[PDB]
Design an enzyme around this catalytic site. Structure first.
Site, PDB file in Angstrom:
ATOM      1  N   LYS B 154       0.577  -1.065  -0.356  1.00 29.69           N
ATOM      2  CA  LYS B 154      -0.370   0.328   0.221  1.00 29.69           C
ATOM      3  C   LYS B 154       0.677   1.017  -0.198  1.00 29.69           C
ATOM      4  O   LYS B 154       1.547   0.982   0.058  1.00 29.69           O
ATOM      5  CB  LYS B 154      -0.829   0.080   1.083  1.00 29.69           C
ATOM      6  N   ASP B 170       7.983  -2.066   5.710  1.00 28.70           N
ATOM      7  CA  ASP B 170       6.916  -3.359   6.324  1.00 28.70           C
ATOM      8  C   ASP B 170       6.480  -3.789   6.253  1.00 28.70           C
ATOM      9  O   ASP B 170       5.956  -4.615   5.805  1.00 28.70           O
ATOM     10  CB  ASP B 170       5.633  -1.706   6.997  1.00 28.70           C
ATOM     11  N   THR B 187      -4.042  -5.623   4.214  1.00 34.96           N
ATOM     12  CA  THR B 187      -5.142  -4.130   4.784  1.00 34.96           C
ATOM     13  C   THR B 187      -6.384  -4.427   4.262  1.00 34.96           C
ATOM     14  O   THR B 187      -6.615  -5.068   2.737  1.00 34.96           O
ATOM     15  CB  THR B 187      -4.618  -2.777   4.096  1.00 34.96           C
TER      16      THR B 187
HETATM   17  O1  LIG Z   1       6.986   3.010  10.430  1.00 31.57           O
HETATM   18  S1  LIG Z   1       7.784   4.092   9.659  1.00 31.57           S
HETATM   19  O2  LIG Z   1       8.381   6.104   9.990  1.00 31.57           O
HETATM   20  N1  LIG Z   1       6.891   4.743   7.911  1.00 31.57           N
HETATM   21  C1  LIG Z   1       6.043   3.476   7.223  1.00 31.57           C
HETATM   22  C2  LIG Z   1       4.636   3.793   7.253  1.00 31.57           C
HETATM   23  N2  LIG Z   1       4.420   2.520   6.884  1.00 31.57           N
HETATM   24  C3  LIG Z   1       2.613   3.451   7.395  1.00 31.57           C
HETATM   25  C4  LIG Z   1       1.668   2.474   8.601  1.00 31.57           C
HETATM   26  O3  LIG Z   1       2.477   2.154   9.880  1.00 31.57           O
HETATM   27  C5  LIG Z   1       2.256   2.598  10.430  1.00 31.57           C
HETATM   28  C6  LIG Z   1       3.053   2.035  11.833  1.00 31.57           C
HETATM   29  C7  LIG Z   1       4.298   2.668  12.196  1.00 31.57           C
HETATM   30  C8  LIG Z   1       5.169   2.463  13.000  1.00 31.57           C
HETATM   31  C9  LIG Z   1       5.004   0.753  13.756  1.00 31.57           C
HETATM   32 CL1  LIG Z   1       6.017   0.195  14.802  1.00 31.57          CL
HETATM   33  C10 LIG Z   1       4.128   0.074  13.523  1.00 31.57           C
HETATM   34  C11 LIG Z   1       2.712   0.828  12.553  1.00 31.57           C
HETATM   35  C12 LIG Z   1       9.575   3.828   8.283  1.00 31.57           C
HETATM   36  C13 LIG Z   1       9.582   2.754   8.513  1.00 31.57           C
HETATM   37  C14 LIG Z   1      10.728   2.288   7.885  1.00 31.57           C
HETATM   38  C15 LIG Z   1      11.906   2.899   7.536  1.00 31.57           C
HETATM   39  C16 LIG Z   1      11.391   3.735   7.908  1.00 31.57           C
HETATM   40  C17 LIG Z   1      12.341   4.803   6.357  1.00 31.57           C
HETATM   41  N3  LIG Z   1      11.557   6.804   6.487  1.00 31.57           N
HETATM   42  C18 LIG Z   1      10.927   6.893   7.028  1.00 31.57           C
HETATM   43  C19 LIG Z   1      10.018   6.176   7.856  1.00 31.57           C
HETATM   44  C20 LIG Z   1      10.129   4.711   8.105  1.00 31.57           C
END
Ligand SMILES: O=S(=O)(NCCNCCOCc1ccc(Cl)cc1)c1cccc2cnccc12
Lengths: 20, 336
Positions: B154, B170, B187
């Site tokens: 997504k 993710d 999702t």
């Molecule tokens: O999680 S992030 O902040 N952004 C991705 C968001 N994913 C969509 C929904 O996630 C909500 C969520 C956030 C944290 C956890 Cl532990 C569970 C659910 C992120 C993950 C991995 C690498 C990143 C690098 N740069 C910025 C953000 C990053």
């Protein structure tokens, strides 16, 4: 319009993952 | 491709069977800002003091992981991520754990999520959409060759990097499985009908999810939406999609073959695998090697204003990272 219906919906924000 | 993938597999298998463990410690990082939150954890921007590199540190509360029955899923995430290597995959740099939490330190993308830009801008042009989709097509080709199913495509899970290329993040539902698997996860908007109808499924659900993504990117909304998940599942299972009038003939035909309830006919799943997708007319402009090489010019490049600027992210309330003086769930997470 479909866009109007979407923007008025409750699911235009970040969508949570689901699990059983 | 075949050759590239064979060698890719050798690389993966070595790390898969002997995973990296305990490669940093919390006190090596300065915590700057929460970039996202979930049910059992958060992700924060951090600075690695020794390098001055910026990273996104995912912090998971072990007790909450255990409460939500996400132990094996969380072990999958770390084990898979440390092993993989591909340009459009966010890199896991370090992992460790303490008494209270699990940590995964990954490569930071200050450009923010695709989701953010897509919602703001409304929709992507077909070439714009096509450019992202190409990187997803290649990434799944890669992952699927390693016997991995991703299971959460997504826009919220696609980061835009400083070259305007994507990083898939993710991997909480990613799994190495050679046969069918049965977990209801994903999702709602993106779930294949197989999943909803509680059948055993396979990597074909990622190809369906690709169909949902392309549609959403190019329309600005998803093919199946309603106010509640149950109303969404009904739509998905009905086997009916309406395309915007602005969708090109080729786009609609690619989407018909991706959003195909019938598995014998769903693209990506057929005898000719991923080439059914790659050699489709909608992609005829795509130079697949130039995409992999990051040589194609990105149709949109995020506004840069520092290696640790957070303006492309929303604000979340901060909370202490507390570490108990007692080890929680040691056994459940022994291999992490
Ligand atoms: O999680 S992030 O902040 N952004 C991705 C968001 N994913 C969509 C929904 O996630 C909500 C969520 C956030 C944290 C956890 Cl532990 C569970 C659910 C992120 C993950 C991995 C690498 C990143 C690098 N740069 C910025 C953000 C990053």
């Amino acid at each position: 319009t479909t866009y109007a219906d979407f923007i008025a919906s409750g699911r235009t924000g970040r969508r949570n993952a689901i699990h059983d | 491709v075949k050759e590239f993938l064979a060698k890719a597999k050798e690389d993966f298998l070595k790390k898969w069977e002997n995973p990296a463990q305990n490669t940093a410690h919390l006190d090596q990082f300065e915590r700057i800002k929460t970039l996202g939150t979930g049910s059992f954890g958060r992700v924060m921007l951090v600075k690695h003091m020794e390098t001055g590199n910026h990273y996104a540190m995912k912090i998971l509360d072990k007790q909450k992981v255990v409460k939500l029955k996400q132990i094996e899923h969380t072990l999958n995430e770390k084990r898979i991520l440390q092993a993989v290597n591909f340009p459009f995959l966010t890199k896991l740099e370090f992992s460790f754990k303490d008494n209270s939490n699990l940590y995964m330190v990954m490569e930071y993308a200050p450009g923010g999520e695709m989701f953010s830009h897509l919602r703001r801008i409304g929709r992507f042009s077909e070439p714009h959409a096509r450019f992202y989709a190409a990187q997803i097509v290649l990434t799944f080709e890669y992952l699927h060759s390693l016997d991995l199913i991703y299971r959460d495509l997504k826009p919220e899970n696609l980061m835009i990097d400083q070259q305007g290329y994507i990083k898939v993040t993710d991997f909480g539902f990613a799994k190495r499985v050679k046969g069918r698997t049965w977990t209801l996860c994903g999702t709602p908007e993106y779930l294949a009908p197989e999943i909803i109808l509680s059948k055993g499924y396979n990597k074909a659900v990622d190809w369906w999810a690709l169909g949902v993504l392309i549609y959403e990117m190019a329309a600005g909304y998803p093919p199946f939406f309603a106010d509640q998940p149950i109303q969404i599942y009904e739509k998905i299972v009905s086997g009916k999609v309406r395309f915007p009038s602005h969708f090109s003939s080729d786009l609609k035909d690619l989407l018909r073959n991706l959003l195909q309830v019938d598995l014998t006919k769903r693209f990506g799943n057929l005898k000719n695998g991923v080439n059914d997708i790659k050699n489709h007319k909608w992609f005829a402009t795509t130079d697949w090697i130039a995409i992999y090489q990051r040589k194609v010019e990105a149709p949109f490049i995020p506004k840069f204003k520092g290696p640790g600027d957070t303006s492309n992210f929303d604000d979340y309330e901060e909370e202490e990272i507390r570490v108990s003086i007692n080890e929680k769930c040691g056994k459940e997470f022994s291999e992490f």
